[PDB]
Design a protein around this ligand. Structure first.
Ligand SMILES: CC(C)CN(C[C@@H](O)[C@H](Cc1ccccc1)NC(=O)O[C@H]1CO[C@H]2OCC[C@H]21)S(=O)(=O)c1ccc(N)cc1
Lengths: 99, 99
């Protein structure tokens, strides 16, 4: 799908059987979600952005189906204001910017 | 141009005679640059990111020339870690996400 940027690029994702909306965020290197249960071993890390840094849990090789496209990669869990799909997963669905 | 997301989507920008690289950021509603001077009056505002908020100066009707495409709109100036071109200006160059 082609997506214009007049509104936030929020898509519906299926992750761990749960339905969530997330931002397709080209300014995010990695994917991060609100608090939720995910499988496998995790490690506490600390990501930062505009204004400061948060503590999250890094889960590896997590599956997400993003607007009907499947991707596997690292998903971080923690107090993010929005779920964001970052470049680590955007690449896997072959997402590009065009102008 | 078509831009893949394996690397950060940086582009060279010309703004008020200055050359800068800025992140094509589809998760940013607004455009913000590190400290610089700009024409016109400005109003202080607060913006919030993943882990906190920052005090920035808001400028309106600022000319930005992004990768050879021109746009005019709001530009915020504050202690951002990376210059980001938000949707308020991505929309003006006809930028779209495609996958
Ligand atoms: C620090 C920057 C490189 C921006 N980042 C991605 C960006 O899309 C965020 C993602 C984002 C989205 C909503 C809320 C917080 C963060 N948006 C953002 O900070 O924009 C703010 C300035 O313009 C305004 O527009 C909305 C928020 C304001 S980030 O969220 O901090 C980030 C950094 C690393 C990872 N792995 C994931 C996300």
């Amino acid at each position: 799908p082609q997506i214009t940027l007049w509104k936030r690029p929020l898509v519906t994702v299926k992750i761990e059987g749960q339905l969530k909306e997330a931002l397709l965020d080209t300014g995010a290197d990695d994917t991060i979600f609100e608090e939720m249960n995910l499988p496998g071993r995790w490690k506490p890390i600390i990501i930062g952005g505009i204004g400061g840094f948060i503590k999250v849990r890094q889960y590896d090789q997590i599956l997400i189906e993003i607007c009907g496209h499947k991707a596997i990669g690292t998903v971080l869990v923690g107090p993010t204001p929005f779920n964001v799909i970052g470049r680590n997963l955007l690449t896997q669905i072959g997402c590009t910017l065009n102008f």
